[PDB]
Design a protein around this ligand. Sequence first.
Ligand code: BXX
Ligand code: BXX
Ligand code: BXX
Ligand code: BXX
Ligand code: CA
Ligand code: CA
Ligand code: CA
Ligand code: CA
Lengths: 447, 447, 447, 447
Amino acid sequence: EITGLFKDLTKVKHARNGRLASWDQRGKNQDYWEIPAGESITLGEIEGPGCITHMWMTSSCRKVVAPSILDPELNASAAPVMEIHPALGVIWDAYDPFYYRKALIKITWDDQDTPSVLVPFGDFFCIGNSYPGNFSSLPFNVSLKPEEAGKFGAPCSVSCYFPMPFNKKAKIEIVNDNELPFILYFNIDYEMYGEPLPEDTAYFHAAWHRENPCNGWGPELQVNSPEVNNVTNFKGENNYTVLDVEGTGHYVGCNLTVKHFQGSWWGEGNDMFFIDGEEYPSLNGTGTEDYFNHAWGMQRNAYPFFGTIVHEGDTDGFQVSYRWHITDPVRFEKHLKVTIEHGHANQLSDDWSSTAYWYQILPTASRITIAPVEDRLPVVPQLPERKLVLPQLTEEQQAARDTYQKRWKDYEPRRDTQFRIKEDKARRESKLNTEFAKKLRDAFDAE
Amino acid sequence: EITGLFKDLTKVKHARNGRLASWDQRGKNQDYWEIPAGESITLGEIEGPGCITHMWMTSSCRKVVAPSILDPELNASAAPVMEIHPALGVIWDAYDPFYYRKALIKITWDDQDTPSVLVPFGDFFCIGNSYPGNFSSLPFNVSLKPEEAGKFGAPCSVSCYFPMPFNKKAKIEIVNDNELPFILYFNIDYEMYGEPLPEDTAYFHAAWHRENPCNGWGPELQVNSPEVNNVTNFKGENNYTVLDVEGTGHYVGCNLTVKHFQGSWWGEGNDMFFIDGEEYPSLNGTGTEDYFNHAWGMQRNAYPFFGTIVHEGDTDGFQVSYRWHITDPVRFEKHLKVTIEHGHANQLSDDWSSTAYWYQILPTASRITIAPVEDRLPVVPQLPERKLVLPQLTEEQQAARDTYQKRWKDYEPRRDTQFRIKEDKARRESKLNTEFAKKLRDAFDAE
Amino acid sequence: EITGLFKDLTKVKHARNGRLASWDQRGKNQDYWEIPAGESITLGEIEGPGCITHMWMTSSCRKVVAPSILDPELNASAAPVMEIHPALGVIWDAYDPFYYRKALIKITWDDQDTPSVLVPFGDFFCIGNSYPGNFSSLPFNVSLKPEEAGKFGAPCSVSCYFPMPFNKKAKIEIVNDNELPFILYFNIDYEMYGEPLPEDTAYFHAAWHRENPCNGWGPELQVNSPEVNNVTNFKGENNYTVLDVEGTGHYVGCNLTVKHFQGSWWGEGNDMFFIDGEEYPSLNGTGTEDYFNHAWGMQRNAYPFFGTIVHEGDTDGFQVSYRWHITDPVRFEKHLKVTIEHGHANQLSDDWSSTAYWYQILPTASRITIAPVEDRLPVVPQLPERKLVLPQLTEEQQAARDTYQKRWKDYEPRRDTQFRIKEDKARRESKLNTEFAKKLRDAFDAE
Amino acid sequence: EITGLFKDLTKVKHARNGRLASWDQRGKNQDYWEIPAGESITLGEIEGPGCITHMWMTSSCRKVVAPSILDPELNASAAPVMEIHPALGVIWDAYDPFYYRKALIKITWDDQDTPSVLVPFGDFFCIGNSYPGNFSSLPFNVSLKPEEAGKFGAPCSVSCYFPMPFNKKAKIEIVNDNELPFILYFNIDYEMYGEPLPEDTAYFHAAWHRENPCNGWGPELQVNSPEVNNVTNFKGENNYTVLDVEGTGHYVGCNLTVKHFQGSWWGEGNDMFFIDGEEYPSLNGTGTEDYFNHAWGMQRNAYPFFGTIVHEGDTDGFQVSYRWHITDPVRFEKHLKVTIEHGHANQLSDDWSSTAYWYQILPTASRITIAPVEDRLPVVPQLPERKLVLPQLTEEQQAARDTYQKRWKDYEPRRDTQFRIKEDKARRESKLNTEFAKKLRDAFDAE
Ligand SMILES: OC[C@H]1O[C@@H](O)[C@@H](O)[C@@H]1O
Ligand SMILES: OC[C@H]1O[C@@H](O)[C@@H](O)[C@@H]1O
Ligand SMILES: OC[C@H]1O[C@@H](O)[C@@H](O)[C@@H]1O
Ligand SMILES: OC[C@H]1O[C@@H](O)[C@@H](O)[C@@H]1O
Ligand SMILES: [Ca+2]
Ligand SMILES: [Ca+2]
Ligand SMILES: [Ca+2]
Ligand SMILES: [Ca+2]
């Protein structure tokens, strides 16, 4: 009979599709949710048994910083994002650079008392450092326009093909720790099953970590100096920790964001895997790019199972990398610790953050935590404070300043009102999304 | 034991390879078929049980438009396509622009009364608008030389890796509705099985559709104006129809060719899927690029499961896109309607054409039809006619024109004869292909 | 329940991960082996039952050609490869151009009296002609820096995802026929199983071949001339042979390196497959790029199942191509001969070399042999020997020459000593890798 | 003493700078003129003796096609050009494609009864076919953003460094034959002399011509066919005419716009120059790209004295080329005819237009004339008429259409009012420019 990776297309399954989407439930063209500031919102709850098969999202986070001559009430029903150059003098909706780190995606399975996915919104979808890079891999993709590329908080399309099965419940939320609301478009595709999945089905988990700085013993020594290279590290007690989880499952890989400070090479450190509580690692690697299957540094390649999302050569000292263990998972019966030396023998004190992805049987024994929002922001240089003192103003210059400020006082509250109306639609459609998914489950189960 | 997408490589299967190919059955180097004008030709018939595993093709359609100083009889045995610049003045075989829409690929399973695949030759192989774009995806690939790219009817290699099981019969035909013959190279690889395929085996299906113009209510209104955006559309009675099919199976995606007329954006319309006769769509999308897993327009990306084949930014207003639902298929027990609003709430009157791909158990309940050839040609701007008046001619210029017309009246019928000869080879090898596949079937079944 | 190519991620397997790596077992930052000149070295032996799931390697081979002002003893403990421009006048470690062809990879399964893999180190990893090209495919990848690309012996990352099951034993070796040692970094991942694999399990095999020159009847005749194209070849006695193997299994593809001499096109020859001892080929192709799923020449494309690794357009007359038959394998019960005509009807006398990959049930019936190292080297044009005569020397010029000669006489032997020390580390780590793999085997089976 | 092309920087000149500019004479930031539709406007008149040394311009011509949610009265005081994507739904100011051909630049010297420069605005500044290309040469330059390039009527900066001496008067005018007004920014630099120039001083002249179609004897014969190539032409009576002028002076070159119809090569025709009424040309060229100092076609090169502005390989069949005879001028005592064969022996019937540049002693003997606006428009292919029909409209769709039509009824006249006010400023500043230029002249002469 039929073999190979396409074989399942040649047999029918009695499974019912459903979809959680930001679709405009007024039937109009606002097919996005305005996610409120400082709030969690449920994209949907799905009753199992079923499986998530595909996620697509895109997003925008703009801060109103100047009055516009665009009617704000009518503007609210036009295109949702005013991609208009500030030089035209007619509007200024600035880019919020770090909104991908200020928002989390949170997934809970089977009404467990802990989430199984708790990751910044960006990093989950392989946006490191809140700074998108255009790439394709087999389970994750980012479609980023070249004219939006190379800035913090650039808009782009994200897609996830990692399957997420659940016997009883799926609850998918966005946690917005931002002071600003943001626009989220999403299509979360699943299928519902007519019979339970095997009780030992492995469920999709993801967790985020940052060490900033890494606790390096030699940050001021040149990388690859004879003195650094002859230091020993076997047990890897101080290694950067990608994942430290208790249970039965397999790790399926990571993304890694590195901001490197000395301007040599951040990546001499070995991956070291500790399976099921062993004291010394059974799986020893050779270097950090080596783990990501590049060599002599990272290259501007993004391959199905590994590579570069954002290359250091294109940025102010930061790299985003990924490797998927899809046909080569790292398996564990009791425990897995995934580590990488942060520089050779933990020499360096760079800014490392990572998303770890794994599958495991429930219950989820490890309690997944997230650093608070103030520990999630990119490290960026800052212009020194310039204490501008106004020259002597003509009456004409003072009246321009006063007229503009009066426009700003009238305009900003009118935009605020339009934001509040859209946030109301989001909270309303959150409920509707869960209600329709319940109706779909019940109608499917009834036959 | 062995898991992951490569696992079937680790176990033998008692199945016998065969291949339908345009190989030169004289044993010489004309390993192509001259497909005759206005005729159908059978690439081959294969007795089941078996599965199509791979198709590769390439093609050329030239029109002789000028006399050549190349001996036409010897020229017939040189390379099959005279890629010689018209400025050399020695030959002119002009490119036929729309031959990809004028020819169909037609596949009938198990001696059914209706084809299960009836699609223009281009569109089946993800050439939209008879206008190749270079790209790769998991099931379909086009390899297009940059020097041939950017023109109607460019030569290129096409490859398909969608499996096509059949229990009783496969009949693969080209329907050439062109006034010209065209050169076809092909390799269709299949394997033969020793036992029947299960009765719930889903068979490969594809069908082509166009709405030109779409029935837009606001083609002259600016896209994303507040008036357009506050129109409602829940039921999608007037949505563009990608697929409307009765049976049990699953949709596995589409290509979509859009020629956009107003010069704004064509893509605001939501995908809406109607499963198993439901009145309101159960699967609600957010936008057309969103369905194709891009955002804020389409990008010049072609990923394994989605993207752009031909970008609007490179063309005279047209886009060719695809999405594959290989791990996330849209299943149906009785019926499936795959629709997309043509602009938000079907505002727009653009030229939309699509290839829908799906698998279903037999029988093919739905008679698959195709629009006639006059309805399949790309919409292109035309130069105004120029009623050129010859100047007063010198004797020398009159002699040149007469000598050239004489050369043309001798040369064209010599080229016509060489075409007719190659067409007799194609008709001969059609029969031989089916005879050999029968020998191979009988020898395999004897052992 | 769960379907599609990711499905195996949703079930746990009670299998234990292991890895053979070049990790520094002093715990320091020499995570590479200095592979000795004219020696074989075991990367590791693993006791089955198990499966290789992933290999990553990179390599460097430099010849010391000038004295350095870098302290040679300290330099041994710095970065392993001195990528320092010779115009600085401080060091010169020249690139060894053909080391990819002078070293072999050699894999023996279940203690058989033949290796099952015996292929030049480069060709195995889809580096043809000892001349890397940057590309991705589903099973094999090369990540080559653009700065390093376009030369013989360029450093690059290689990865292999073809699974390699074994019930009793895996033995992975490098055979270095080079007069120079070379640096090898490697990570070889596998999993160990608690029960045997089915005895009918198909084992990974690969073998290498070269015809230089091919035995052409008409190398001086223009390709695609009428005289060439009307020559017949049905039976393919003189076809280039990619593979000729007795057993039960399936061919999963090749790489092919062609150096072309006449400056026209090397690729008119058809693939012809002979299954189970048939006299005439049952699988006839149409041309060599056609086999590689390109058309009208090879393109600068590398797609998941086929394409170009190195494009003839970018070199001095040579191409490196691949095709993978992963979902479309060529199966055989008794025998398989994979051939391609070398030019149409074997017209041409070019330099062809290939790696064939297949799976088969044990035993390996025939010894896999390899051409000796003198027959494995790329064909490169040579500068005529420029018999330089020194002019009359000033005393200062003579003293400069003597001083330099003297530095070289002291420096070279100090670099030799440092190579011998690293070679001793490789031989020591060879034994430790096998001992650790046995400990892991025993501790796994103990549970 | 000092030599070379820089030498004149080492000697002072008792000459006064002046400048005609579109500077905002309200002292605000509208430093452009809205040139009224269907009017001429004087950029300025300058009393001699003096010399124009430098001209810079840019321009914009938008058509309001949709209602804006931008307040139009406030919008008039923001940036002058709403470079805002129509897909945002907030504004639509469409590009007018042919304004470069609908407006002329007209310069009259010494109050003569003819202009000495009468050339379409675009063509004068080496914008051919109302289609800018980015380039630099010694006397003319275009700086065109890549984002704006590849479209009719793209905004770009133009600069002219040809000197224009005048003993008595310079009058510089724009002649706007467009139905639409357009924005013009300009800076025209000159110096004023304290004594007359020698009376024999040669004055700058330019004239424009178009032959569409050219009067070809053989447009349907393949270019470079032996029949075409053996037709003779010594006297060039039917040659394309770049310049045909009576006086004493020198030709300093041309730009040439060709739209080529047969898709071979337009450029086999020789330049032939007839000096001082000779019957047979004394200067015989070899081909059209040869005249332009390219070969085997035109290249994407733009060099100080010659090259390509717009390359045929980037357009729908049209090329724009230039040559400057700055050190190699073509001198005449009584008469010059500059001709080029329109294809070999005037075979072809393509669309040729040119700007000829020359210097000559006054008087300008013959009126410089120009084809009327309807004879100046690029030849472009036209889409067939779409004859859309509205479907049956919902009450909602009808209400949206009525609301949008009402917004447009109100909005368009509001934009018309703002254009009329800016046109009043242009007419006002025309007078002020000439008044100020007279005050400068008188103040300088007083000194
Ligand atoms: O890729 C080989 C080695 O080169 C260096 O960049 C190290 O990080 C690595 O282990
Ligand atoms: O990608 C987000 C949204 O942007 C617009 O171009 C819409 O087509 C889409 O719904
Ligand atoms: O790809 C079509 C044909 O063109 C030539 O390059 C041949 O090698 C091939 O069979
Ligand atoms: O450049 C040499 C010759 O090549 C052809 O394109 C002719 O137009 C020209 O005279
Ligand atoms: Ca290391
Ligand atoms: Ca929408
Ligand atoms: Ca052939
Ligand atoms: Ca000529």
